[PDB]
From a paper:
Kainate receptors, a subclass of ionotropic glutamate receptors, are tetrameric ligand-gated ion channels that mediate excitatory neurotransmission. Here we present cryo-electron microscopy structures of the kainate receptor GluK2 in the presence of the agonist glutamate and the positive allosteric modulators lectin concanavalin A and BPAM344.
Processing of cryo-EM data revealed two main compositionally different groups of particles: with ConA bound and without ConA bound. Both ConA-bound subgroups showed a distinct separation of the ATD and LBD layers, with ConA molecules serving as spacers. Notably, the ATD and LBD layers in ConA-bound structures showed a dimer-of-dimers domain arrangement, typical for closed-state GluK2 and AMPAR structures. Instead, the ATD and LBD in the A and C subunits are connected through ConA dimers acting as extension spacers. There were two types of ConA–LBD contacts, with the predominant type I contacts involving the A or C subunit LBD and type II contact involving the B or D subunit LBD. Despite observations of several configurations of the GluK2–ConA–Glu–BPAM complex, with one or two molecules of ConA bound and type I or type II ConA–LBD interfaces, all these configurations demonstrated a similar structure of the LBD–TMD region.
Numbering used by the authors:
A (entry chain E), B (entry chain F): 1 to 237
The structure:
Amino acid sequence: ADTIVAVELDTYPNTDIGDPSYPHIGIDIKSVRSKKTAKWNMQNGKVGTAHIIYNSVDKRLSAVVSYPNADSATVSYDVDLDNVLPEWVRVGLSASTGLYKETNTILSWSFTSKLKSNSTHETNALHFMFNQFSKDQKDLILQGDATTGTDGNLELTRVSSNGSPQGSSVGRALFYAPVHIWESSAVVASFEATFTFLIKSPDSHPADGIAFFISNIDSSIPSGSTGRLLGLFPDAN
Amino acid sequence: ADTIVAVELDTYPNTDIGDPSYPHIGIDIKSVRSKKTAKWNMQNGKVGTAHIIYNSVDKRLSAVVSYPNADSATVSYDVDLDNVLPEWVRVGLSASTGLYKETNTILSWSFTSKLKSNSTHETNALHFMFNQFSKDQKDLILQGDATTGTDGNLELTRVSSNGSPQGSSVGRALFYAPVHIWESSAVVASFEATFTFLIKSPDSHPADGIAFFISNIDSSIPSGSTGRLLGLFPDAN
Ligand SMILES: *[C@@H]1O[C@H](CO)[C@@H](O[C@@H]2O[C@H](CO)[C@@H](O[C@@H]3O[C@H](CO[C@H]4O[C@H](CO)[C@@H](O)[C@H](O)[C@@H]4O[C@@H]4O[C@H](CO)[C@@H](O[C@@H]5O[C@H](CO)[C@H](O)[C@H](O)[C@H]5O)[C@H](O)[C@H]4NC(C)=O)[C@@H](O)[C@H](O[C@H]4O[C@H](CO)[C@@H](O)[C@H](O)[C@@H]4O)[C@@H]3O)[C@H](O)[C@H]2NC(C)=O)[C@H](O)[C@H]1NC(C)=O
Ligand SMILES: *[C@@H]1O[C@H](CO)[C@@H](O[C@@H]2O[C@H](CO)[C@@H](O[C@@H]3O[C@H](CO[C@H]4O[C@H](CO)[C@@H](O)[C@H](O)[C@@H]4O[C@@H]4O[C@H](CO)[C@@H](O[C@@H]5O[C@H](CO)[C@H](O)[C@H](O)[C@H]5O)[C@H](O)[C@H]4NC(C)=O)[C@@H](O)[C@H](O[C@H]4O[C@H](CO)[C@@H](O)[C@H](O)[C@@H]4O)[C@@H]3O)[C@H](O)[C@H]2NC(C)=O)[C@H](O)[C@H]1NC(C)=O
Ligand SMILES: CC(=O)N[C@H]1[C@@H]2OC[C@H]3O[C@H](O[C@@H]4[C@H](O)[C@H](O[C@@H]([C@@H]1O)[C@@H](CO)O2)O[C@H](CO[C@H]1O[C@H](CO)[C@@H](O)[C@H](O)[C@@H]1O[C@@H]1O[C@H](CO)[C@@H](O)[C@H](O)[C@H]1NC(C)=O)[C@H]4O)[C@@H](O[C@@H]1O[C@H](CO)[C@@H](O)[C@H](O)[C@H]1NC(C)=O)[C@@H](O)[C@@H]3O
Ligand SMILES: [Ca+2]
Ligand SMILES: [Ca+2]
Ligand SMILES: [Zn+2]
Ligand SMILES: [Zn+2]
């Protein structure tokens, strides 16, 4: 199995495998059984503002989500990125659904690592600002059944049947280039994200949520994940 | 051949194929016959500072080289990056030598693309700061006989014979990810580079220089370049 750490912007309450009763933001270490959860609003088709950092000066993997005219859901978990996440990685997005529909329109995405040559000595970056998901974007090795383009969009579904996006489809959005992390050159790489999304109400109880992972340099769609596995865990444990 | 535009920091005056009678800095549009030239001091092992930009509001393609306590060589050339270099690229470094030895140590490298989604609408980046070329850097697809590591160094020769780097050595340093250019969405992708080299005096009339190219997404070392072909040209025209 692939070593993986996700941040769940879940929309489906998975009571059986361990999610709380409401649509929530959370955080995952190698299991769908999250470490912390928090209250998330889950409005209809509106837009976007999510934000995930990790400063090893403070070792908090902090995360907030805001609609404009909404709150900020802090779901920060104490995790040491020393021993949990590989020496070189492959970041990306992940959405999925199964037996229920939701729209998972991503419209922009970013990153910024800053990793410690000699702590002051000019930390290495990988900053990008993808406001322009093209039709033929090629620094993504997008897996599953994700699509892109036709507008500035990264559709992590099988879509365009009036955008009621054809339940039990999964597509991930793995960015091309790796990042050195594990510790080894210690682990102050304050990796940021901004994750402007759009979850349209399908008039069908919108459910399964979008994620944000940092996986191994290899991955796949693990063992079939058309549903509760959130696109990236092979098993529900 | 493969379409490629480089900045030759040539250190042998290739007297028969277009370069001047002095070791210069040039700029190459598909031809080792250059488009500008500029006088270079050729100091011994001292560090580095070279810097290459291209906006498309002013359409000049520029470069300078100054050692600290030395002067700069503005070898800027006006060329239309619209029709000369493909949409998706693979940036990086190229050095070579043949029958003459020199040091081609690179210690740091950076970049910043900014390509015009809708000019103010939050253009896309790929910025990095590689001050710390490690032993197992894996967003580099370094071709030829390039080495790295053992220290923070990128060694584009075959090295460690007391830094007498084993002539007829060629090494390339192709970065991993692609960038949109050609024009199409227009071409103001103001790509920067920092090119901090080290050319140690090997006490051996040091001569062939490092380049900085921008190529197609596919490449190799073309038809042998152990010498004046400068690592990226198949042909001397
Ligand atoms: C039949 O016709 C053909 C052609 O018409 C002739 O065949 C050969 O053609 C070759 C064409 O490529 C050509 O080779 C190139 O020569 C140039 C010029 O350099 C040398 O040219 C002659 C070759 O003998 C001579 O005039 C010189 O020997 C000259 O070489 C210089 O020699 C110095 C002392 O020997 C030498 O000092 C050396 O220093 C180093 C360290 O610094 C050593 O360790 C040692 O201590 C010393 O020997 C000089 O450095 C040396 N060079 C110079 C510039 O003065 C040459 O530019 C080219 O080499 C280039 O190619 C590589 C490829 O990447 C590139 O990196 C450089 O640009 C490099 O300069 C070729 O060598 C020959 O002229 C020719 N061969 C001969 C023997 O003449 C035939 O001659 C014709 N037959 C008949 C019967 O006429
Ligand atoms: C083995 O021993 C033999 C001795 O017998 C020697 O080998 C060869 O022998 C051949 C016959 O004996 C003979 O071959 C000659 O080749 C040259 C090569 O042409 C270029 O090089 C010249 C060097 O002096 C230049 O002066 C020329 O101008 C010529 O350049 C041409 O013009 C353009 C650039 O100037 C270029 O256009 C480019 O094309 C690219 C393509 O993509 C770009 O888009 C853009 O359009 C341009 O940049 C042309 O392509 C280019 N032509 C080429 C590369 O072929 C040839 O010129 C020559 O013809 C004349 O040569 C002299 C004048 O130069 C004249 O006196 C003759 O009578 C003849 O008319 C021959 O075909 C050579 O003797 C030799 N070849 C050598 C040495 O290179 C060698 O000594 C030994 N070794 C080998 C490996 O053979
Ligand atoms: C076939 C059967 O007997 N199913 C049982 C179920 O057995 C396994 C199934 O698990 C999922 O089934 C869903 C629920 O778990 C639920 O309860 C039963 C179900 O009958 C459970 C345990 O009791 O065991 O049934 C819902 C259907 O919704 C009705 O039940 C609700 C109770 O949770 C309750 O709100 C209502 O009775 C509701 O009826 C509708 O709602 C209102 C509210 O009262 C009524 O007034 C309406 O008239 C009525 N109709 C409508 C149209 O509103 C069932 O969905 C299921 O597993 C899901 O798989 C999906 C794929 O990812 C995903 O959604 C999620 O992972 C799973 N959901 C879970 C576990 O809850 C199936 O695999 C199994 O059939
Ligand atoms: Ca789930
Ligand atoms: Ca030369
Ligand atoms: Zn969840
Ligand atoms: Zn030159």
